[PDB]
Amino acid sequence: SNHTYRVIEIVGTSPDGVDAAIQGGLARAAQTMRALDWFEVQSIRGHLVDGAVAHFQVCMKVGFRLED
Amino acid sequence: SNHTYRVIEIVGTSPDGVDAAIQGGLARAAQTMRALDWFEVQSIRGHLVDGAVAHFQVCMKVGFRLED
Amino acid sequence: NHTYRVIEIVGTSPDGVDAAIQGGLARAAQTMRALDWFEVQSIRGHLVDGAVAHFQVCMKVGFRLED
Amino acid sequence: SNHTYRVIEIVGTSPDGVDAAIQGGLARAAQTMRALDWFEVQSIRGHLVDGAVAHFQVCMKVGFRLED
Amino acid sequence: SNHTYRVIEIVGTSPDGVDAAIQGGLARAAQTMRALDWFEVQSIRGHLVDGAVAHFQVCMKVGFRLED
Amino acid sequence: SNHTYRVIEIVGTSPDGVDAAIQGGLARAAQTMRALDWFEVQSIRGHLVDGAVAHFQVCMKVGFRLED
Amino acid sequence: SNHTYRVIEIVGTSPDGVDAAIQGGLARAAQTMRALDWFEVQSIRGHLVDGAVAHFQVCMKVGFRLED
Amino acid sequence: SNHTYRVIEIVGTSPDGVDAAIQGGLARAAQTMRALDWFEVQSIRGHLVDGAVAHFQVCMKVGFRLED
Amino acid sequence: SNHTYRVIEIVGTSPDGVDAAIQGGLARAAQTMRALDWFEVQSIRGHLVDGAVAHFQVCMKVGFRLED
Amino acid sequence: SNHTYRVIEIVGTSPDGVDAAIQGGLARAAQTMRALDWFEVQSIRGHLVDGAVAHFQVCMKVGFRLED
Amino acid sequence: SNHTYRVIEIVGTSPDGVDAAIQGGLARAAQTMRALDWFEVQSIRGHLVDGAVAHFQVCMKVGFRLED
Amino acid sequence: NHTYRVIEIVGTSPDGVDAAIQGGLARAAQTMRALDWFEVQSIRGHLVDGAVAHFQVCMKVGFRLED
Ligand SMILES: CC(C)(COP(=O)(O)OP(=O)(O)OC[C@H]1O[C@@H](n2cnc3c(N)ncnc32)[C@H](O)[C@@H]1OP(=O)(O)O)[C@@H](O)C(=O)NCCC(=O)NCCS
Ligand SMILES: CC(C)(COP(=O)(O)OP(=O)(O)OC[C@H]1O[C@@H](n2cnc3c(N)ncnc32)[C@H](O)[C@@H]1OP(=O)(O)O)[C@@H](O)C(=O)NCCC(=O)NCCS
Ligand SMILES: CC(C)(COP(=O)(O)OP(=O)(O)OC[C@H]1O[C@@H](n2cnc3c(N)ncnc32)[C@H](O)[C@@H]1OP(=O)(O)O)[C@@H](O)C(=O)NCCC(=O)NCCS
Ligand SMILES: CC(C)(COP(=O)(O)OP(=O)(O)OC[C@H]1O[C@@H](n2cnc3c(N)ncnc32)[C@H](O)[C@@H]1OP(=O)(O)O)[C@@H](O)C(=O)NCCC(=O)NCCS
């Protein structure tokens, strides 16, 4: 037989930067999901409070292997 | 950093128009989902019957804050 | 089994997006048969006196080809 | 001689729908700008409060003729 | 009212080609999902081993009718 | 110093696959049109009947040389 | 008014350049079509012979107002 | 620090072609803007009158170095 | 309804990285603009000198609420 | 590790179909290139003769790991 | 039942225009490469010196038949 | 006057996006001359044990062609 994958979309956030947002988001996914394989960034965004980046926001597609 | 969002995709439908289709799709999401925050229209389509629009169909991405 | 044709039109209306969509499809319906679906390609409009004179909705329209 | 146009980007908002957001945004532009000619929609979005569309948000490119 | 569709994203795989990969992914979705209506290919990819295609990988959006 | 080409859009269909759907569409185009030169796939879609692919649907742009 | 427009797709060609390719195609559309209003360039392509550009090929969408 | 660039969008027009339209728009921008560095074409369009191109219209993003 | 936003485009730059480029561009915007609300990265580019990155350059759309 | 990959672009062709076109091109890349890892389909095109598909043409990006 | 094509990317430049920039790039490609078949413009850009276009820059994809 | 070549590479790094970008350009710099610019095409990564094993940044890299 042959594997099928599922691709969900999440947004990781961090006040520090793009990498921390990515990893922040993936950690929350890892808490409940198994067989996480890859991610792809869809967009990089952020919210500004008093002229400053309050949160970096990285929208990601996340691929994991489907269990039966 | 801590907050993570989930982005699901739905198609709202209505015979009345684009707004009606958007609000009908979102309304079904609100029956089961919590902390809904935003939507984005991916496309606007429709099925035609008797040379007129039977249903407007608006495809939407919908973001909500993930609970623990 | 069936082959479909996809043509591109622009429906316009001073009232809004729905009316523009419908205005355009109705003109298509006058001459074309077996119209099945549509997809909006863009939503534009012409402005006069700083207000929307016409909403213009570019659509692709799919209909089943006859023999 | 021959005309040049300027293309700015705005987001109109309304709690009623897409058309009202478009027109809401264009009215604010008209208050200060002259020779407004066309617009194109870049995206349709919205903010959700208690499962409901609080504001429809329509990001638009707006073209106007440049004065000298 | 009038239906709302849910649109999920999966990746079908097969060593045999694009069709088999497509039918492979959908067969896994059909094991657990009801009222599957349509699919759209997002991309066609593959992993290569020793200079030959090990698996075709077809990423699909898949739309089904939501139950209450 | 001369020729102009026309580009029309069709959707070929077939229960057998992507290739069959491509050829099925082009064959209909070949019944009436002359000097067909190239095609380009715009999208691969399909309708699902109780979990299986009923019809593969391949949307194509088809280019042909215009006669005077 | 509440006019409807038709958008067709053509490829104008010329050995001289992009401009010449655009007007070559539009002239051919102008031989049969009425109320031509606008064009939009989709792509700029060409064919190479002996390491030179034999023909510039400009693919255009051409919008015209439908008569009754 | 290190510079920030501003990126504006204009439409150059000319009855003569794409180059002249491009140079036309930039000449108007250069009348009032300083430290113009680059441009990128977004689209090439035109208005048609009596079956012929009245004006070429080239939409450009234009980047200049911000002063303090 | 009433609130309207403006979306300008800027390129932040830094020799240090992507985050640094983002924050430097936004910082220049905050010196003169008020009620900044969000940004979106349009692209990530850079200039190379001596076979290394002299400056990271992140192109950003930046939205702010229009005052009366 | 901290490997770097090279992505090249090829068009595989076959009169038989899409799958056959993909593997035709990959086999030619496999005749000279080492550590081929993945491909992504960019477009599916073809040439028409006598109203039939003479050659399926699949444009692919092909990623391989750079050696030292 | 055979040929494979290679697709490389170059940027032709010229102070005279888009066409000249296209031909200038292809001529360099013609100096070393054989069986050049087509090109496609990816983007039209340019560098500005004190308000005027210094160099038009046309990025192209260039396709040629691979020899054995 | 000058013609440029645009190649596509993927720089990787377990540390982040910048390090991935730089890791990739450095490998390019080992063999290529007159490297002038880069553009990021995508940011991806491989996951192991539910954490980022490698950040992968696909880039187009422009360099001036010699004669
Ligand atoms: C609601 C939601 C955010 C909760 O996610 P979460 O809190 O992060 O984690 P979940 O509660 O989903 O738990 C993960 C589930 O996937 C399962 N799972 C984890 N990895 C898996 C994988 N590799 N393959 C198959 N199943 C897996 C877990 O066992 C668990 O299943 P269970 O609940 O049946 O025991 C998420 O499930 C979701 O967004 N679902 C979609 C909801 C939707 O489509 N909305 C409808 C509105 S119209
Ligand atoms: C199946 C499905 C259509 C049903 O959606 P629904 O009828 O709108 O409601 P659900 O059954 O998902 O219930 C909502 C869930 O979200 C959870 N929830 C709601 N809002 C949440 C939020 N803000 N954060 C975290 N969890 C939330 C609820 O607790 C509930 O979970 P539970 O039933 O396990 O306790 C939908 O969940 C779905 O499409 N998900 C799976 C699709 C899929 O990927 N299938 C794989 C086939 S290959
Ligand atoms: C700040 C801003 C939002 C204010 O806009 P507004 O309140 O809606 O209206 P403005 O204050 O701009 O007034 C319109 C101006 O354009 C002029 N104008 C109007 N239509 C015009 C047209 N057809 N052609 C030329 N000028 C025109 C008006 O005369 C007025 O000029 P003036 O201020 O020199 O007297 C807007 O000007 C803007 O976003 N500018 C860009 C700021 C920017 O780039 N940010 C830099 C941060 S890095
Ligand atoms: C977890 C997952 C991989 C498992 O998928 P699966 O093994 O193919 O099938 P599931 O276990 O989800 O079962 C499908 C569910 O949808 C329901 N269902 C099926 N078709 C439906 C439809 N047409 N309408 C409404 N509900 C439907 C089924 O009853 C079942 O619900 P149940 O588990 O409460 O009984 C998949 O559900 C998924 O990717 N969910 C989203 C997880 C997610 O978003 N993670 C968040 C991490 S941040």
Ligand SMILES: CC(C)(COP(=O)(O)OP(=O)(O)OC[C@H]1O[C@@H](n2cnc3c(N)ncnc32)[C@H](O)[C@@H]1OP(=O)(O)O)[C@@H](O)C(=O)NCCC(=O)NCCS
């Ligand atoms: C109506 C339609 C679906 C029927 O297509 P079809 O049955 O496959 O083929 P047609 O009946 O059009 O026949 C093809 C025509 O093109 C001509 N033709 C074929 N190749 C040609 C060529 N390369 N150069 C010039 N003419 C050519 C044929 O001679 C024939 O013309 P004729 O019957 O007037 O002599 C199709 O023509 C179409 O989609 N037209 C556009 C419809 C439209 O835009 N409607 C607007 C609604 S708002």
Ligand SMILES: CC(C)(COP(=O)(O)OP(=O)(O)OC[C@H]1O[C@@H](n2cnc3c(N)ncnc32)[C@H](O)[C@@H]1OP(=O)(O)O)[C@@H](O)C(=O)NCCC(=O)NCCS
């Ligand atoms: C066949 C074709 C190439 C011939 O085009 P052409 O030589 O440039 O011009 P045509 O022969 O179509 O003549 C132009 C038509 O448009 C009509 N016309 C022109 N402008 C019009 C306008 N503004 N509004 C309404 N009608 C208009 C003319 O009356 C004429 O039709 P007529 O022969 O009934 O008088 C072209 O019409 C075409 O590609 N049609 C579509 C073919 C198609 O879809 N095939 C499907 C294959 S599956």
Ligand SMILES: CC(C)(COP(=O)(O)OP(=O)(O)OC[C@H]1O[C@@H](n2cnc3c(N)ncnc32)[C@H](O)[C@@H]1OP(=O)(O)O)[C@@H](O)C(=O)NCCC(=O)NCCS
């Ligand atoms: C109004 C507008 C059309 C007029 O443009 P214009 O006639 O070509 O030139 P302007 O009058 O704006 O003059 C350029 C300004 O930029 C300044 N400037 C020029 N180059 C600069 C640079 N490199 N860095 C910083 N400032 C610069 C000039 O000093 C001048 O400022 P000043 O008017 O305060 O003296 C144009 O400025 C515009 O589109 N602005 C945005 C309006 C807008 O966003 N509207 C909001 C409606 S909701």
Ligand SMILES: CC(C)(COP(=O)(O)OP(=O)(O)OC[C@H]1O[C@@H](n2cnc3c(N)ncnc32)[C@H](O)[C@@H]1OP(=O)(O)O)[C@@H](O)C(=O)NCCC(=O)NCCS
């Ligand atoms: C010229 C420019 C670079 C200077 O930007 P800057 O140095 O960052 O600061 P500005 O000079 O724009 O000053 C900020 C303006 O925004 C206004 N403002 C700030 N935030 C605002 C907000 N939230 N809502 C409304 N107005 C606001 C300020 O009052 C000020 O206007 P004023 O100087 O007329 O009183 C910039 O304004 C610009 O690029 N605009 C014009 C570009 C253009 O379109 N030129 C046309 C050439 S064809």
Ligand SMILES: CC(C)(COP(=O)(O)OP(=O)(O)OC[C@H]1O[C@@H](n2cnc3c(N)ncnc32)[C@H](O)[C@@H]1OP(=O)(O)O)[C@@H](O)C(=O)NCCC(=O)NCCS
């Ligand atoms: C010219 C070309 C078509 C010939 O390709 P080909 O026949 O398939 O194979 P080549 O002749 O290049 O040989 C493959 C090379 O890759 C090298 N190689 C293979 N896999 C490798 C890898 N994983 N890592 C590092 N090197 C590898 C081989 O050593 C061989 O080089 P060598 O001749 O020094 O031993 C192709 O190399 C090409 O298109 N090059 C680019 C041309 C170009 O950019 N022209 C610019 C015009 S302006």
Ligand SMILES: CC(C)(COP(=O)(O)OP(=O)(O)OC[C@H]1O[C@@H](n2cnc3c(N)ncnc32)[C@H](O)[C@@H]1OP(=O)(O)O)[C@@H](O)C(=O)NCCC(=O)NCCS
């Ligand atoms: C290095 C480079 C810029 C030089 O290009 P150039 O000076 O215009 O041309 P080249 O020196 O490569 O000569 C073209 C080669 O392709 C061959 N060639 C030309 N047409 C061919 C064809 N259609 N089929 C097969 N080979 C062909 C030529 O014979 C010559 O090969 P040879 O010298 O080994 O006999 C170019 O080859 C290139 O961009 N290569 C890829 C660089 C790269 O990917 N670097 C990785 C850094 S991480």
Ligand SMILES: CC(C)(COP(=O)(O)OP(=O)(O)OC[C@H]1O[C@@H](n2cnc3c(N)ncnc32)[C@H](O)[C@@H]1OP(=O)(O)O)[C@H](O)C(=O)NCCC(=O)NCCS
């Ligand atoms: C000029 C044009 C807009 C007129 O459109 P219209 O007035 O709305 O409708 P038409 O005049 O084409 O009439 C509809 C045609 O489609 C046919 N038809 C309707 N539905 C059909 C379907 N489902 N399948 C096949 N044929 C169908 C009708 O029989 C009629 O053909 P007929 O005139 O030979 O009897 C025309 O359709 C068109 O845009 N064709 C293409 C123009 C073109 O390509 N020109 C090339 C310029 S270079």
Ligand SMILES: CC(C)(COP(=O)(O)OP(=O)(O)OC[C@H]1O[C@@H](n2cnc3c(N)ncnc32)[C@H](O)[C@@H]1OP(=O)(O)O)[C@H](O)C(=O)NCCC(=O)NCCS
């Ligand atoms: C295999 C490959 C990755 C090796 O890359 P590498 O090890 O990083 O560097 P190379 O081995 O190519 O060496 C760099 C070349 O570019 C040349 N060069 C460097 N900078 C240059 C520049 N600015 N302009 C022109 N030439 C340059 C060098 O002189 C050298 O050529 P040489 O080997 O003839 O002396 C190769 O460059 C490649 O990917 N080529 C294309 C592969 C291909 O198209 N194969 C077809 C398969 S179907």
Ligand SMILES: Cc1cc2nc3c(=O)[nH]c(=O)nc-3n(C[C@H](O)[C@H](O)[C@H](O)COP(=O)(O)O)c2cc1C
């Ligand atoms: C993906 C693809 C794109 C092509 N684009 C063009 C084009 O834009 N213009 C053109 O004239 N020919 C185009 N062609 C046709 C090629 O020029 C064709 O392969 C060539 O003319 C055949 O000659 P050969 O014997 O060298 O292979 C394209 C072919 C393919 C496969």
Ligand SMILES: Cc1cc2nc3c(=O)[nH]c(=O)nc-3n(C[C@H](O)[C@H](O)[C@H](O)COP(=O)(O)O)c2cc1C
């Ligand atoms: C915009 C464009 C796209 C093209 N795409 C392809 C293609 O994908 N595959 C191909 O083989 N030829 C392609 N071609 C080349 C055409 O097939 C070419 O115009 C034709 O073969 C020339 O024959 P003719 O005498 O009928 O004009 C393309 C040409 C143009 C202008």
Ligand SMILES: [Cl-]
């Ligand atoms: Cl998506």
Ligand SMILES: [Cl-]
């Ligand atoms: Cl933009």
